[PDB]
Amino acid sequence: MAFRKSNVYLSLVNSYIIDSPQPSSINYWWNMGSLLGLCLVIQIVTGIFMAMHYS
Amino acid sequence: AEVTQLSNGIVVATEHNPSAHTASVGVVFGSGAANENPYNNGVSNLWKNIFLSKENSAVAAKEGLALSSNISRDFQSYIVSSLPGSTDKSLDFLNQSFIQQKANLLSSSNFEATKKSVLKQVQDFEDNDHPNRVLEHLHSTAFQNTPLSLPTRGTLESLENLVVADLESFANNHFLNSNAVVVGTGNIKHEDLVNSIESKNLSLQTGTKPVLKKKAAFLGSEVRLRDDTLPKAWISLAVEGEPVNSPNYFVAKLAAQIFGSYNAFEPASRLQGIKLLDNIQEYQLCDNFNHFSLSYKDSGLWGFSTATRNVTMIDDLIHFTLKQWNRLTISVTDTEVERAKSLLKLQLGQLYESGNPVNDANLLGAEVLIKGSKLSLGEAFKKIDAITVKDVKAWAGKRLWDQDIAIAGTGQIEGLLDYMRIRSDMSMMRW
Amino acid sequence: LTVSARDAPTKISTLAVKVHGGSRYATKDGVAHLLNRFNFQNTNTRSALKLVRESELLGGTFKSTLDREYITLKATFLKDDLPYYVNALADVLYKTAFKPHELTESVLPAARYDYAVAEQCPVKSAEDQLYAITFRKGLGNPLLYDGVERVSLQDIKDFADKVYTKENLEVSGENVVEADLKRFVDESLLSTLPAGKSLVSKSEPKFFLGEENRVRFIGDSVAAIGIPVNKASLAQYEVLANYLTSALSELSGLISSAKLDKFTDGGLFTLFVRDQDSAVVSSNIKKIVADLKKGKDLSPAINYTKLKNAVQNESVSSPIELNFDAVKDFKLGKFNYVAVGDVSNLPYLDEL
Amino acid sequence: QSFTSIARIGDYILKSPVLSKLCVPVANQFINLAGYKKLGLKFDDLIAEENPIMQTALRRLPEDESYARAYRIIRAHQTELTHHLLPRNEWIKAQEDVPYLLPYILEAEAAAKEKDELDNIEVSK
Numbered sequence: 001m002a003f004r005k006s007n008v009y010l011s012l013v014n015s016y017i018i019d020s021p022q023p024s025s026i027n028y029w030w031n032m033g034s035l036l037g038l039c040l041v042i043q044i045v046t047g048i049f050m051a052m053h054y055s
Numbered sequence: 056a057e058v059t060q061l062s063n064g065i066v067v068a069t070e071h072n073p074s075a076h077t078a079s080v081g082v083v084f085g086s087g088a089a090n091e092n093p094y095n096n097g098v099s100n101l102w103k104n105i106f107l108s109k110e111n112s113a114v115a116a117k118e119g120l121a122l123s124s125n126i127s128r129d130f131q132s133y134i135v136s137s138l139p140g141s142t143d144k145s146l147d148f149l150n151q152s153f154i155q156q157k158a159n160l161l162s163s164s165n166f167e168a169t170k171k172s173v174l175k176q177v178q179d180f181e182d183n184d185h186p187n188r189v190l191e192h193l194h195s196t197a198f199q200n201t202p203l204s205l206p207t208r209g210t211l212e213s214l215e216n217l218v219v220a221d222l223e224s225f226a227n228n229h230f231l232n233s234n235a236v237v238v239g240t241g242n243i244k245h246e247d248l249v250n251s252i253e254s255k256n257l258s259l260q261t262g263t264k265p266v267l268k269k270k271a272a273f274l275g276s277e278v279r280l281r282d283d284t285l286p287k288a289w290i291s292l293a294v295e296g297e298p299v300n301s302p303n304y305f306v307a308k309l310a311a312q313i314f315g316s317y318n319a320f321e322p323a324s325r326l327q328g329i330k331l332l333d334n335i336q337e338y339q340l341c342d343n344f345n346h347f348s349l350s351y352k353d354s355g356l357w358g359f360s361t362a363t364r365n366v367t368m369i370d371d372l373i374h375f376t377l378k379q380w381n382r383l384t385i386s387v388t389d390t391e392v393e394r395a396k397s398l399l400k401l402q403l404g405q406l407y408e409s410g411n412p413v414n415d416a417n418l419l420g421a422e423v424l425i426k427g428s429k430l431s432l433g434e435a436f437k438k439i440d441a442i443t444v445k446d447v448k449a450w451a452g453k454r455l456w457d458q459d460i461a462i463a464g465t466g467q468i469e470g471l472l473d474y475m476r477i478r479s480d481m482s483m484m485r486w
Numbered sequence: 487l488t489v490s491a492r493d494a495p496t497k498i499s500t501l502a503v504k505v506h507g508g509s510r511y512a513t514k515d516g517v518a519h520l521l522n523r524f525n526f527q528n529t530n531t532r533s534a535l536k537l538v539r540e541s542e543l544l545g546g547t548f549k550s551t552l553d554r555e556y557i558t559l560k561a562t563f564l565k566d567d568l569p570y571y572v573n574a575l576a577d578v579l580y581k582t583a584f585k586p587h588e589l590t591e592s593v594l595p596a597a598r599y600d601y602a603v604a605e606q607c608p609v610k611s612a613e614d615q616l617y618a619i620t621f622r623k624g625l626g627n628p629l630l631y632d633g634v635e636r637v638s639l640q641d642i643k644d645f646a647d648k649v650y651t652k653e654n655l656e657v658s659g660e661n662v663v664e665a666d667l668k669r670f671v672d673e674s675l676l677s678t679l680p681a682g683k684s685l686v687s688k689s690e691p692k693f694f695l696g697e698e699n700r701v702r703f704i705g706d707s708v709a710a711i712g713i714p715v716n717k718a719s720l721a722q723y724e725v726l727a728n729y730l731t732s733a734l735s736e737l738s739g740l741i742s743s744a745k746l747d748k749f750t751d752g753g754l755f756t757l758f759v760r761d762q763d764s765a766v767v768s769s770n771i772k773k774i775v776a777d778l779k780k781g782k783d784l785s786p787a788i789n790y791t792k793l794k795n796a797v798q799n800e801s802v803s804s805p806i807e808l809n810f811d812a813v814k815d816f817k818l819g820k821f822n823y824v825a826v827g828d829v830s831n832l833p834y835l836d837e838l
Numbered sequence: 839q840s841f842t843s844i845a846r847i848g849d850y851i852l853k854s855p856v857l858s859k860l861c862v863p864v865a866n867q868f869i870n871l872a873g874y875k876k877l878g879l880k881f882d883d884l885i886a887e888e889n890p891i892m893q894t895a896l897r898r899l900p901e902d903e904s905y906a907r908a909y910r911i912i913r914a915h916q917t918e919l920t921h922h923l924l925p926r927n928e929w930i931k932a933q934e935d936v937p938y939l940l941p942y943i944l945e946a947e948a949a950a951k952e953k954d955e956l957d958n959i960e961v962s963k
């Protein structure tokens with residue numbers, strides 16, 4: 001089988017982000033979740049860099 | 056190995072062979088299913104069936120003659136086989152059925168009995184012959200709204216609405232002299248046949264030409280005939296191939312030989328020198344597959360067909376197969392090419408030189424109708440041996456690399472991914 | 487060790503080693519099948535893999551077919567490479583390894599698939615039943631392996647010892663120069679094979695008549711009749727088969743198939759009626775038995791049966807040829823019957 | 839809410855000429871405003887299926903209706919994703935909007951309710 005499916009780490013990525021079967025009709029309202037993950041990342045990255053200068 | 060062909064009033068083509076035991080004679084017209092319409096689709100197949108009707112067939116059986124017909128896309132043929140001595144009696148039956156009985160075969164009792172038979176015939180095909188059914192639909196979607204899209208056997212709806220008049224209309228527009236070639240194979244001489252033909256005069260609809268149309272074109276697309284009740288998944292996938300009389304006619308056929316055909320149950324098949332087999336045998340991605348390079352007058356199809364019971368891994372089957380095809384543009388090896396040459400010769404030989412004259416007639420007829428001559432088997436081998444890795448790469452980089460594809464399938468094809476996923480695999484990422 | 491041949495100006499040659507080792511002369515059930523499936527596996531000097539890899543580069547393939555009487559090891563290839571294929575075939579006949587793992591991993595599976603394909607076709611289930619009742623133990627031996635009786639690796643080896651001998655095989659190369667062929671055959675391991683005996687008995691097989699068998703089957707129903715023919719009375723049945731399978735006979739559209747299996751010591755005539763529902767199978771065969779009982783012919787298909795028996799170019803070594811232009815009448819004595827499918831709605835030997 | 843309960847209330851209204859003439863016209867207008875018919879769906883195609891009752895019911899549905907439900911559902915998703923409605927001539931007509939799955943659902947609920955009753959039956963001596 002393809003490496004993305006056989007490798008222990010990549011298969012997680014494959015099942016969640018690559019081959020994950022999505023209902024054909026989901027609309028833009030289903031885009032909020034990824035936007036929330038992005039928000040979490042922006043908050044963490046910017047906070048760590050600021051923490052470097054915070055007392 | 057003699058290709059003799061002369062023209063008097065009609066074009067006569069023959070290929071004599073000493074030891075043969077039998078001789079086959081027949082007329083091959085330069086028009087087939089590709090000349091029909093979506094509405095009279097199946098008229099040619101219908102003609103073939105009355106030509107082989109119990110009535111017309113019994114008349115030939117008394118005389119000791121055997122009948123055979125073949126409906127293709129670019130052509131159509133009616134053949135009569137006989138002993139080397141009765142080479143003249145085949146011509147009597149040929150003329151008697153295409154001039155004398157070209158009104159007796161079309162009786163209201165014969166037509167209805169035949170129509171009822173081709174209906175159960177075409178229905179049985181659609182109900183059970185899945186691999187050919189899929190291959191037929193492949194042509195249908197690949198060449199949609201174009202001549203090559205029409206199926207050879209015709210569709211059930213166009214067939215049941217067909218009448219005696221439609222047969223006549225087609226016959227009077229295509230069964231012409233300028234759109235025909237009389238072929239003779241077996242053991243009989245060229246001079247032996249041409250004399251019996253030039254003996255009986257009468258032109259019958261001479262100077263008349265068949266109607267014209269629009270050029271065939273490939274359209275990247277797909278048709279999915281999902282059916283979860285079938286025990287397998289049958290798929291066919293292809294790119295625009297090469298038309299007959301194309302410089303790459305052989306390069307394409309060689310390319311298909313590299314991947315060849317496979318049968319998981321035949322021990323010897325599992326041992327072939329095909330790299331793709333290392334990938335597909337681990338989890339047994341399929342029961343069988345076979346590559347092909349179909350060539351027609353205006354275009355062709357290059358790809359493969361496959362059957363599988365591994366319904367949850369169809370994506371790996373398609374993925375590994377397309378990755379191998381990617382290799383043709385970038386890394387095919389000398390030895391892969393050389394293996395293909397040897398195997399292409401063996402298969403091309405087994406086709407062109409079988410112990411059956413009826414096959415020879417179809418091969419000869421189809422060729423002379425398109426290029427006005429036949430390339431000798433020895434001439435082919437010279438072209439085949441001349442192919443280099445550089446040739447295959449140049450061909451693949453034009454026909455396979457990042458090119459649209461056509462897909463068709465039936466059975467449990469839920470696992471066959473969307474078009475774009477398959478299409479993306481027609482290439483590779485690079486710096 | 488009959489070495490036949492026949493040259494020609496063509497580019498494809500085809501070597502073939504016919505061997506009298508079909509199911510007819512089989513010690514245990516299906517052993518001939520297993521041996522046929524064992525051909526082209528590993529030899530003591532060349533592995534199955536290498537054989538294929540080498541032959542592919544040259545431009546030729548191998549194949550091993552099984553008959554009720556023969557076991558043919560054919561090899562199609564490009565003309566000039568003749569010697570290679572002669573020695574390849576020699577190698578197989580003289581020294582195939584017969585490793586225990588080859589049995590379990592390649593032979594048994596391939597054989598199981600063979601039996602599976604045939605187990606699903608009702609006409610073949612019938613054709614087998616026909617042979618088993620006519621010739622109760624000669625040609626009536628099971629063609630394929632199904633495991634009813636044990637067959638060890640040794641049994642396959644012992645059988646290969648009996649069957650693979652110079653006095654029981656015949657080399658036959660189509661499109662080959664007889665000069666070089668005979669030379670290479672004697673210059674190979676063929677001549678080193680321990681020439682045993684030939685089991686081709688001339689005495690007519692003790693066939694039975696008025697025998698019937700019924701087998702319940704899910705799918706298409708098929709009623710068939712089988713008739714044991716004589717060594718000289720086979721030419722008429724040949725025309726009969728081609729008559730029933732032609733536009734001349736009115737009842738041609740009432741049957742699925744009809745043929746005559748020609749052997750070395752007789753033959754067998756078969757007639758098959760196959761259809762979805764039992765009603766159409768009953769009527770169609772009941773009509774045939776009635777029309778054939780009040781038999782007729784008049785030899786209208788005398789040239790047709792001679793034409794169809796000529797298109798078989800691989801059989802240019804056939805028995806009688808001019809026996810056709812003799813008898814022109816046919817009746818229908820006692821025969822054998824087999825009902826396969828919807829048994830409870832199928833005719834018996836009585837009502838025929 | 840079980841379909842047995844919806845049927846109880848619904849039938850009581852349908853039998854009484856007082857309510858039947860008052861409610862039905864309202865219900866009919868509600869159904870048209872819903873709009874599922876413009877997508878080619880029948881109400882029963884809309885029932886949430888991720889529960890044992892609905893799985894039992896869908897399992898018992900005859901082949902022809904099953905293949906039909908499948909086509910309607912697939913056709914609805916495709917139309918929804920294209921942000922269109924089907925051509926009016928393809929809409930489901932009121933005569934076609936029949937409760938085809940309802941009888942199977944009611945039967946399964948009754949069977950289920952009986953098992954629950956029997957598994958908890960008390961005994962008096």
Ligand code: HEM
Nearest residue numbers: 039040041042043044045046047048049050051052053054
């Ligand atoms: C989802 C996660 C987070 C959320 C919602 C969040 C939210 C906030 C908010 C509301 C403030 C005040 C903003 C203002 O100045 O008005 C703040 C401040 C701060 N955050 Fe976070 N935060 C998150 C994660 C982090 C993380 C992981 C760090 C890492 C140390 C961090 C470090 C800080 C620091 C240093 C400040 C003070 C600087 C500032 O005022 O912006 N934050 N955060």
Ligand SMILES: COc1c(O)c(C)c(C/C=C(\C)CC/C=C(\C)CC/C=C(/C)CC/C=C(\C)CC/C=C(\C)CCC=C(C)C)c(O)c1OC
Nearest residue numbers: 016017020022030031033034036037038040041044045048
């Ligand atoms: C079936 O439905 C799905 C679905 O399944 C998925 C997966 C997606 C796709 C969306 C996602 C997978 C979102 C996922 C997001 C997350 C898991 C975010 C998790 C959060 C994190 C903060 C990750 C942790 C990060 C860090 C440790 C890095 C920060 C620090 C750094 C770089 C070090 C800095 C310091 C120095 C010195 C350089 C869908 O959109 C979707 O519906 C359409």
